[PDB]
Structures are given as C-alpha cells and as structure tokens.
Amino acid sequence: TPILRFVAVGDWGGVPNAPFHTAREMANAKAIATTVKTLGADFILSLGDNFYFTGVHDAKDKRFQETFEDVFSDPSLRNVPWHVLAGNHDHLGNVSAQIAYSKISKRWNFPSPYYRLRFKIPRSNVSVAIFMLDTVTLCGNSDDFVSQQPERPRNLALARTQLAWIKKQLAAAKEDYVLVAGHYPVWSIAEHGPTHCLVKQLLPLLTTHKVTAYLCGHDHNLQYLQDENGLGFVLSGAGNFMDPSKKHLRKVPNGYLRFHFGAENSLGGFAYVEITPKEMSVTYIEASGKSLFKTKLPRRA
C-alpha cells in the first residue's frame, strides 16, 4: 500500500539554561528515533515553540546545535527532513534567523513564516497538501499580553495578508488530503484553550474548504478533537513539557474532545501520521513508547 509517513511534534524547544534541553525533550528525541527506525518517516513537522523561552538571536545562535541538532542526533533521525513553523516563544526572538538557518542545516526547512508543502504518495496519484501557518503573526504573540492569549496581531498588514493567502490557497487546493498546521489551537481543553482568533477567522475556512485536519501545539499535552462535520484537530504539544490542565474543558463544544493525555508525570509524546490512498491515520505515542490512541480520517471527496 502506498504510504506517506510523518511525525508531528510540538513545543520541543528545550531551555535556555545549560544543558539546553529537558529530560522530556530527550525522551521524545529517543522515542521519535525508535518510531522512525521501526515504522519509517518521510519527514518531521515541528508545530512551533522551537527554542524556549525567547527563541534565537540570529542564524549562528548556538541554540540551534544545543537544543536541536545535538538532541535529534540518534542515527535513525540523521537526514530525516524537518518542516518547521514558529510559535510564540520563537517570536520573542528572531524568527528570520530560524528561516535563514534553512541555508545552514540540510534537514531544517523553514522557507518563510507561512508556506505550502505538496507531496505525492509514492507509486500512486494521491496527493497531500500541508499549509504551514504563522499563527503568531496572524493572531498576536500570547507572550505580549498578561492574559497569555493572542489578543490582537502586532501588525495588521501581516495578519490580513496571511489570512488572504490562506483563503486563496484553501479555495484552490485540489489535493486528496489537505492539512493545515499552526502553533496555536483552534480547539483545546487545556491551559490556553481555544484561540478566539482562529475559531473566528480560520475555522470557517477549514470547514468551507473541506480540510482534513488542523494540527497544532501550544497546549503542552496530547489531544484529538473532531467536530460534527468530521474535521479533525490533532494537538501535539508535548515534546518538552506536560501540563495536565483541563482549564478550558467547558470552552470546547461538547463531544468534540475524543482523546486527551496530559499526565503530569509523563515524559510527553507526539503524533505519528500515516496517509495512504485509503485514509489518513493518526497515532498518539507517549515518550515512553506506548501507543495511546489511534484514529483515522477520510480522503476528501
């Protein structure tokens, strides 16, 4: 069966004090390496918060080696490409530096704040589009507000331009599977909860244009949510931290939550996505190696 395989990991960005990683980040690096070795991966998606707590200063920042390259260094992961987007902490520093780092590290691919990826499932005519968004420039930086919510964008032109781009791209996308990814959640039951900006501006487009799933991090846990139209919400924000909060449980429409794992003494985890001509599958994997939940999502008509 033709297949495209990828890991989606969020909020993995270590720490700025020595040794520049956490035990959770290392456990996820090892667990991801084991998953790649045993099941395979064509690429890894980062769902943002790549360098805690204030990003990187420029493209030569030692954190690229300390928190990224040296951490994800097990043999099975050498040469697996990453496709990256930014979170709020990245935007407290220099995101242009993370984009420029694409020219330094072969496996790091981050061409602009938001961009389109297209894949053909090998030995099939089935196609996949992934739209990588910058939810910080769209909605604001949550760290700019005492509320730790993205109350408004810093720059109106950047936000309006990205929204227009999303709309145009989603209206034109002909692919068999269409995924959208961004740092902040549409829906989440946890410490930050739903992002009002995305519920208002992005979700109507995901629905109208029959997107398969929206992938995100930002809340430091694992969740699968699904609305009554079958649109999936893959929340994978557990590469470095585990927050057991259910603070926003009642702010998500009843029944949307299908799976949640946030145990405070867990090492975290990630999502593993498999796309075939038959369906898309998502498996949530704890950093201890345990498979926690698996679900499938359909092809677009």
Binding site members for Fe cation: 11, 49, 52, 88, 183, 218, 220
Of the pair 37, 152, the CB lying nearest Na ion is at: 37
Cα-Cα end-to-end distance for the chain: 20
Write the single-letter amino acid at 73. Answer: S
CA atoms of 63 and 81, how far apart (whole Å): 19
Residue 58's binding partner among ligand NAG, ligand OH, Na ion, none (Cβ under 5 to 8 angstroms by kind) is ligand NAG
- Residue whose pair of structure tokens reads 């699968």 in the numeric block: 224
Residue 134 makes contact with ligand OH by CB under 6 A: no
H/E element, 233:
strand 232-236
Q: Contact between 4 and Na ion (CB under 5 A)?
A: no
Residues 50 and 84: beta-carbon distance below 8 Å: yes
**Beta carbon of residue 85, minimum distance to ligand OH (angstroms, whole number):** 13
The nearest distance, CB 93 to ligand NAG, in angstroms, is 8
Dihedral of alpha carbons 33, 89, 86, 236, sign = positive
DSSP bridge partners of 294 = 283
Among residues 25, 218, 280, 284, the one that binds ligand OH under rule CB under 6 A: 218
Binds Na ion (CB under 5 A): choice among 1, 17, 18, 75: 75
Contacts of 254 (CB under 8 A, 6+ apart): none
User: Which listed range, 16-24, 51-59, 223-231, 267-275, lies at the site for ligand NAG (CB under 6 A)?
Assistant: 51-59
Report yes or no: 271 and 232 within 8 Å, Cβ to Cβ. no
Binding range to Na ion, per CB under 5 A, among 74-82, 194-202, 204-212, 226-234: 74-82
Question: Is position 84 an interface residue for ligand NAG (rule: CB under 6 A)?
Answer: no
Question: Looking at 97, 128, 133, 159, which residue binds ligand NAG (CB under 6 A)?
Answer: 97
Cα 221 to its chain centre, rounded Å, is 12
Tell me: does residue 100 bind ligand NAG (CB under 6 A): yes
Binding characters for ligand OH, 39-78, by CB under 6 A (x = yes): ----------x-----------------------------
Binding partner of residue 94 among Na ion, ligand NAG, ligand OH, none, CB under 5 to 8 Å per kind?
ligand NAG
Please give the helix or strand (H or E) that residue 257 lies within, else none. Answer: strand 257-261
Is 196 within 8 Å of 157 (Cβ atoms)?
Answer: no
Q: Would you count residue 50 as binding Fe ion (CB under 5 A)?
A: no
What is the number of helices (H) and of strands (E) in the chain?
A: 8, 14
Q: Which stretch binds ligand NAG (CB under 6 A): 57-65, 67-75, 218-226, 282-290?
A: 57-65
Binding Fe ion (rule: CB under 5 A), the pick from 35, 50, 88, 266 is: 88
Q: How far is the CB of 284 from Na ion (least distance, A)?
A: 21
User: For residues 9-48, which are near Fe ion according to CB under 5 A?
Assistant: 11
Q: Which long-range contacts (CB under 8 A, 24 or more apart) does 138-144 make?
A: 138/162, 138/163, 138/182, 138/197, 138/198, 138/201, 138/202, 139/184, 139/195, 139/197, 139/198, 140/197, 141/88, 141/91, 141/92, 142/88, 142/184, 142/192, 142/218, 143/88, 143/89, 143/91, 143/92
> Please, what is the minimum distance in Å from the beta carbon of residue 115 to ligand NAG?
18
- Residues within the interface to ligand OH (CB under 6 A): 11, 49, 87, 218, 237
